[PDB]
């Protein structure tokens with residue numbers, strides 16, 4: 275039952291990928307991705323690590339390097355996105371999630387984010403971070419995060435890696451809608467140079483085209 279420690283690796287200027295793990299029944303050890311976004315001495319977390327231990331490590335790294343931590347946002351309700359919300363809340367670090375995500379956390383007896391993002395589109399940190407709802411896919415609540423300054427789309431678990439043979443855990447998925455939702459994201463984010471999936475290797479807009487195709491054949 276050992277798991278690796280969190281690691282933090284640079285994607286490009288001002289953008290860091292955090293990778294953490296959990297052992298999940300039926301899947302074994304699973305790697306999970308989130309980001310730290312830096313701008314003008316401030317930091318913002320996109321999805322928490324998958325444990326308290328790793329959330330603490332990440333926050334310590336941010337503070338060690340002199341950055342002001344403005345908070346976290348989670349891109350859907352499952353534990354690989356939200357495990358550290360309680361830890362962040364208890365340490366007085368602002369946590370954010372959408373109305374739908376916070377509703378689903380409460381329904382499943384989980385600690386909700388302190389702040390709620392309303393509507394299909396939201397803006398964080400004075401335009402640095404844009405949150406967009408493409409439609410149902412992996413879950414009904416899934417959102418993507420666009421970083422206009424970096425030309426990065428963080429897809430979360432709405433986007434699959436290129437080596438993925440399937441859509442992953444589909445127990446709560448909207449498979450028919452997912453292909454259309456993926457097209458919505460493709461049409462909106464033509465500028466995207468880098469796309470980051472919730473699990474697996476980063477790439478370009480090809481990840482969205484592959485995800486779209488996977489959804490089409492899963493139907």
Ligand SMILES: [Cl-]
Nearest residue numbers: 276277278279
């Ligand atoms: Cl361990």
Ligand SMILES: [Cl-]
Nearest residue numbers: 283284285291
């Ligand atoms: Cl990388």
Ligand SMILES: [Cl-]
Nearest residue numbers: 352354431472
């Ligand atoms: Cl997930």
Ligand SMILES: [Cl-]
Nearest residue numbers: 374407414415
């Ligand atoms: Cl929604």
Ligand SMILES: [Cl-]
Nearest residue numbers: 431442443472
């Ligand atoms: Cl997933």
Ligand SMILES: [Cl-]
Nearest residue numbers: 437438439440
């Ligand atoms: Cl695979």
Ligand SMILES: [Cl-]
Nearest residue numbers: 304442443473
């Ligand atoms: Cl997966």
Ligand SMILES: [Zn+2]
Nearest residue numbers: 350352412431
């Ligand atoms: Zn999920």
Ligand SMILES: [Zn+2]
Nearest residue numbers: 354431472473
């Ligand atoms: Zn996931």
